[PDB]
Nucleic acid binder design. Structure first.
Ligand SMILES: NCCC[C@H](N)CC(=O)NCCC[C@H](N)CC(=O)NCCC[C@H](N)CC(=O)N[C@@H]1[C@H](O)[C@@H](OC(N)=O)[C@@H](CO)O[C@H]1NC1=N[C@@H]2C(=O)NC[C@@H](O)[C@H]2N1
Ligand SMILES: NCCC[C@H](N)CC(=O)NCCC[C@H](N)CC(=O)NCCC[C@H](N)CC(=O)N[C@@H]1[C@H](O)[C@@H](OC(N)=O)[C@@H](CO)O[C@H]1NC1=N[C@@H]2C(=O)NC[C@@H](O)[C@H]2N1
Lengths: 122, 54, 117, 119, 211
RNA sequence: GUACUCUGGGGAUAACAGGCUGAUACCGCCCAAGAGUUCAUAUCGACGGCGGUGUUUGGCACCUCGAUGUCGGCUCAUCUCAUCCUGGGGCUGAAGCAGGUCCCAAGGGUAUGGCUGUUCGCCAUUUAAAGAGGUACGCGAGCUGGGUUUAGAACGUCGUGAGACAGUUCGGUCCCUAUCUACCGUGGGCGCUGGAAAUUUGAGAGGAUCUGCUCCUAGUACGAGAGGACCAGAGUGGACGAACCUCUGGUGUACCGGUUGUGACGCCAGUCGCAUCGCCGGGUAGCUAUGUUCGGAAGGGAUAACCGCUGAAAGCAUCUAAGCGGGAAGCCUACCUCAAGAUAAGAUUUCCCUAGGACUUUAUGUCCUCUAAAGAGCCGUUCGAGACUAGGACGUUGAUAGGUUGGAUGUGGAAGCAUAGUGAUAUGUGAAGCUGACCAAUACUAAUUGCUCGUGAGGCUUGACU
RNA sequence: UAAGUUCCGACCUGCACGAAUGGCAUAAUGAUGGCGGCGCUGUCUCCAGCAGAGGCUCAGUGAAAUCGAAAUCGCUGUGAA
RNA sequence: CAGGUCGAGUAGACCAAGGCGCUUGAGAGAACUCUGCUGAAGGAACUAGGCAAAAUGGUACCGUAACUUCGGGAGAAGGUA
RNA sequence: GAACCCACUGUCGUUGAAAAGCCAGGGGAUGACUUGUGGAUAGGGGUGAAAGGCUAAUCAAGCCUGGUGAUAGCUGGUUCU
RNA sequence: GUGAGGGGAGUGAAAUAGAUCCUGAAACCGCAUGCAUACAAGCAGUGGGAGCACCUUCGUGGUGUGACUGCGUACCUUUUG
């Protein structure tokens, strides 16, 4: 349940450490973004000498939320943090490693690389 | 906020047309033969063939 | 049994008849059925039971674990067919029904003492 | 809305309400016949009758529970000596609430509360 | 269309074999007894009138007692009509009964009920009005209506202006629900989702009109 | 000089809003040099001409100075169409995808932030789109009070000075319990051709009306390539709305437990009062969204622009004059809710009342006597119904409420007594004790004896059948 | 800062700074003016539940400002507009 | 003048001696208003402005920068029991 | 940092409990401090760490009584046929 | 209620001269009788006009009411209005 001004950790090695959501994409007046939704972010902290830098405006996909997601049997899965993965201008991941578990909502053709790189899919 | 014109006696009485009082439900008690308020103990302490105060 | 008898009768025909006895503070392994296309498999979810709701067919229990440095909790619905099997690996010694205080502890501070017969 | 809710307010805080109903129960157990307002009389059943139900078995734990609820040693003694044996075979309904007209000072509806086998 | 009158018993869930949890509402159906058939010749329209439940004779009036005795059926707790067509009228006669077997598993139905009563309610809850600031100098206007009109032109409040008033306790129809189970031995309909009203209320189940 | 100010007056006379007008403003049309490789009119269009609207800047001084008291924001709106998106078309310097221009169309929809008191504007990032206007430049007896425009103080500047400003800066009281109209809800009365209990028809009224992306047709038609469709299907979302509480959560000051200080119950033990529910951890029902489900689907009829068929006036041609068609998110239906105070007061089923005297005002006539129906209400136990009402259930031939018994749930190892320890404490008895609102049984308690209202076959005229 | 009419530093064509109507600075101090950050949060997205006091009903007491008189509707037009 | 238990205290919580329950009550538990408690995910996106709320908070020890009129800054910050 | 003396912010109150307050925060608190009693300064005068502040709920000239029935080219009103 | 207040009795020419007591107007507020009034839009009247009730010199009469209907935006002041 991510909205504008929300801070997110970065679950990859693109170089950013903390990002801030500045827009939820996908419709007029849309309020929240969940796992698998695309957001616009600004980079608040980054690794020195990395490709991405502080103050960059990029696209990202949300991979973990504290609000959690629902499953068809009525269960809910909740994580301890809100995390995102950086994407390029074509909305494709631009990292080579994934940190922490992700969920099966990412099993699409767009985000199959995250699934294949993640240490755990639950 | 306050009226611009004084209200007529006719309109005042028309408003009061709903102020009439009604009657209570009174019944005669079989044990004593006295009038009492229905479902209530009588003023002498009797109800439904029982006595409260010796 | 706070519902009408007809509702109770409808719920009773779906109850599982082989669940083990487990309590908050235990560590359990839950086998979840994962269906991909037509590929069926079983995935293990192992962790500490921090909450348990006993409501007949509406029973549930919450399991918390640490995965690659990230804490994750899942609220399993006890009688759902998705939960294939529940194993109790170790019995814990706690003083309360709900263990939400474990969410603010890490590593050594979050250790649960074993219940000794 | 107050859908399916139980309990009363009577223009009092919760602690004041609890103390008032405690006092009413003690007075009723002492005198076996009291006069009060109708809402207080009707709510007094839910407080007084479980005490009589508890007093049917004379144990140390039951006496201590009764003392915690009433804070009156004479009330505890009377409950466990007279009232409980009296109602040992009666399945509830130890009180009797009867409408008793209205009060002069404020026109408040009144009622009598009586023990079932007073005399 | 011809339907059924039932009573809402409460909500529960059904687990499918794949593990999906389906939220469902249970409807008890005392088999509806036909009390009168209305035709074009005598009434000017075609309907089937039914009754269901029970009622004690001290509460059944003499007129209703005669009405039930003409049909030859026991008095019910309610009487209700269904508008029907000539094809639907086939096989239905006064004194017959209609059961849960009128519906089949998987059929799409509409369910009508009487929604819960919320009493006197304000703009925020009744019409989703926005509240004004809780701070920044706002005096006593947090949940009030605000402006209700324009000015000298037109110098009045238009009809249909949204204001505070009674909310709930109204007839509501929910369309497009799916029949999950038809239990004939228990005389029960299990439908998917939520239906209007409180537990114990009277509901009407009809075949969907969005066909 | 007065902003430290005061009195008598004026809407005879200014600032706001209204009014008249329309120079100005905005919009449209006529002619057409020319531009467009040729070619005025695909798209522009000089020099000139004719109008429309009532948004702008103005002109006038008709209303208000025994007061019409506000720039912007907030909340809530309603209308217009000169249409921003979505829908339907003609032309094109329209291959396709796109675009340009004009016509029809007002059903719905139509951003969040940084800066500034701002409206505006610039910028960042979205969206199908972020339309133009009227409504006292809508809305302050609905909120605010940042700007302007009292009294304090300072700077630049002007003045000898009191003081002042095509200026700036720090600070600086927002009253009113709603009579009438209007509006949102909810009742009382009477009427409706004897009375009553139910079920109903629908004259009509309101609600709703939005849209993205992916796949497929098909890398097909088209195109040198680059690119890339119409039409027609499937799936999955955004915003909006309703209902609901099975699931996920919040709350849950009458449920359970831990614990600090103090006082008390004679003392230990065990408890209770007060300290925000003392604080802290949980939590049943109910309520609730951030949770769950559902909706705007499909189809008829008349049309708008536009496209016709046949066809003369006018031997040809021609959608039109006779005659016959197609055609839109728009209209009437269709979907949901309300609806006979629809005084035109409608329909159907069933139920109730069939007695005697006197008199004159010989009449649905006035007094007597006898009758009191079917039902309705008062009262009581109450409710998932409720401000009061109204509405629903029940009143002993009874489960309506409380209690009682059982179950379930929550909290979690009661008290007492035993052990083991110097002791704090731990263990056993035993998942014990306690458990608001839940489920099911159960007349123990309370719904008692009752009363009031509502009558006695329902005028006359004509017609059709008896 | 993603985006800065405010802020900080600098530039000097200062409409119209300038040396006791003092000039330029200055540690400490200020319920003094402006700008930024951490923590924090119902300020807000967007409100929900609960407690007390009113509101509402009943019994008692019992005001107010205003007021030519009222059998005190909508729309379009008219008309001291 | 002014006691007790904790306490630096005449602060504070609960009590003593000694005084009071404040001269309308009884019900109900709608909108709306006032005063409080709690709140999923987010955390100033609110707004003229973090207004208001939330937050910090004790004792002992450790440790503490630029600047400085050498006094300060300083309880800086931060940490342990 | 209490008493005591003040009055920076906010909600409430505005026919108030009150013709200037309550509540939650806030400043000083051995000094240019706060305070009792009794005195002195009197209206173009007094007093003023200076706001035209204060001088009995009254201040760019206090209050009371007289001149006095001030004057008003202004507004209102002006009674039977 | 040994209250207040009243009904009789008695006094007096008169007690509706009975104590805040001669006369007892109007605004304003009750009770009783007659007629009208719950499908109809506005300065409330005016010119017509049916019916009803009582009275009666029996009518071409008197009193009260007024279904239905044409017309009809108070008064004063100040003003071009
Ligand atoms: N221009 C017109 C553009 C049409 C649009 N692109 C298609 C679309 O989404 N339509 C409807 C629409 O959003 C809305 O309904 C209506 N009618 O407005 C909603 C709720 O009714 O249902 C959608 N349909 C759906 N089908 C889906 C289903 O079954 N599961 C998953 C979810 O995707 C469901 N929503
Ligand atoms: N001969 C006729 C003479 C006529 C007489 N002039 C009429 C008159 O003057 N009326 C005055 C009305 C004032 C007050 N409303 C009276 C009342 O109604 N009191 C109710 C009490 C009645 C009860 N039954 C007796 C009771 O509990 N007593 C206690 C007790 O003695 C004691 O406590 C302990 N723990 O022992 C004491 C503490 O010191 O407190 C007393 N309680 C108290 N409550 C009183 C309060 O608040 N204020 C005044 C004073 O009375 C206080 N004391």
């Amino acid at each position: 349940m991510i909205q504008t001004e929300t801070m997110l950790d970065v679950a990859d090695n693109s170089g950013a450490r903390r990002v801030q959501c500045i827009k939820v994409l996908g419709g007029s007046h849309r309020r929240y973004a969940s796992v698998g939704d695309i957001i616009k972010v600004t980079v608040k902290e980054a690794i020195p000498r990395a490709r991405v830098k502080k103050g960059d405006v990029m696209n990202a996909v949300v991979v973990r939320t504290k609000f959690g997601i629902r499953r068809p049997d009525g269960s809910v899965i909740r994580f301890d943090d809100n995390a995102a993965v950086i994407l390029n201008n074509n909305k494709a991941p631009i990292a080579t490693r994934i940190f922490g578990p992700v969920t099966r909502e990412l099993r699409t053709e767009q985000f199959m690389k995250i699934i294949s790189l993640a240490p755990e899919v639950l | 906020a306050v009226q611009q014109n004084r209200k007529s006696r006719s309109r005042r009485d028309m408003r009061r047309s709903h102020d009439a009082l009604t009657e209570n439900a009174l019944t005669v008690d079989q044990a004593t033969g006295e009038t009492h308020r229905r479902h209530h103990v009588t003023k002498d302490g009797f109800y439904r063939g029982r006595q409260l105060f010796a | 049994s706070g519902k009408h008898p007809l509702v109770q009768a409808i719920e009773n025909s779906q109850l599982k008849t082989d669940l083990p006895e487990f309590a908050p503070g235990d560590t359990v392994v839950v086998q979840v059925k994962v269906k991909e296309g037509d590929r069926e498999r079983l995935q293990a979810f192992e962790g500490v039971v921090i909450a348990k709701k006993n409501r007949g067919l509406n029973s549930a229990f919450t399991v918390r674990k640490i995965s690659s440095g990230v804490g994750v909790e899942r609220v399993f619905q006890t009688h759902s067919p998705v939960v294939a099997k529940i194993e109790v690996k170790r019995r814990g010694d706690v003083r309360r029904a709900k263990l939400y205080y474990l969410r603010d502890l890490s590593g050594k501070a979050a250790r649960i003492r074993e219940k000794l017969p | 809305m107050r859908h399916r809710n139980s309990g009363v307010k009577l223009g009092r805080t919760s602690s004041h309400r609890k103390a008032m109903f405690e006092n009413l129960a003690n007075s009723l157990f002492e005198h076996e016949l009291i006069k009060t307002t109708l809402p207080k009389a009707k709510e007094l059943r839910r407080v007084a009758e479980p005490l009589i139900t508890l007093a049917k078995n004379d144990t140390v734990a039951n006496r201590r529970l009764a003392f915690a609820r009433t804070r009156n040693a004479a009330t505890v003694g009377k409950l466990f000596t007279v009232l409980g044996p009296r109602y040992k075979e009666r399945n509830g309904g130890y009180l009797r609430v009867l409408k008793a007209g209205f009060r002069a000072g404020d026109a408040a509806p009144m009622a009598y509360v009586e023990l079932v086998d007073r005399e | 269309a011809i339907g059924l009158v039932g009573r809402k018993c409460g909500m529960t869930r059904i687990f499918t074999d794949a593990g999906v949890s389906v939220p469902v509402t249970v409807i008890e159906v005392d088999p509806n007894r036909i009390t009168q058939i209305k035709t074009l010749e005598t009434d000017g329209y075609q309907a089937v009138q039914v009754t269901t439940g029970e009622r004690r004779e001290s509460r059944v009036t003499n007129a209703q007692k005669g009405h039930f005795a003409k049909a030859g059926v026991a008095a019910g707790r309610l009487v209700k009509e269904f508008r029907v067509t000539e094809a639907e009228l086939e096989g239905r006669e006064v004194g017959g009964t209609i059961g849960v077997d009128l519906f089949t598993v998987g059929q799409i139905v509409d369910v009508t009920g009487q929604s819960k009563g919320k009493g006197f309610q304000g703009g925020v809850k009744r019409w989703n009005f926005r509240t004004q600031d809780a701070t920044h100098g706002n005096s006593v206007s947090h949940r009030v209506l605000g402006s209700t009109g324009q000015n000298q032109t037109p110098g009045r409040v238009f009809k249909g202006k949204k204001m505070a008033g009674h909310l709930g306790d109204e007839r509501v129809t929910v369309q497009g629900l799916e029949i999950v189970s038809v239990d004939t031995e228990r005389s029960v309909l299990v439908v998917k989702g939520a239906i209007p009203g409180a537990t114990g209320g009277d509901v009407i189940v009809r075949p969907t009109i969005k066909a």
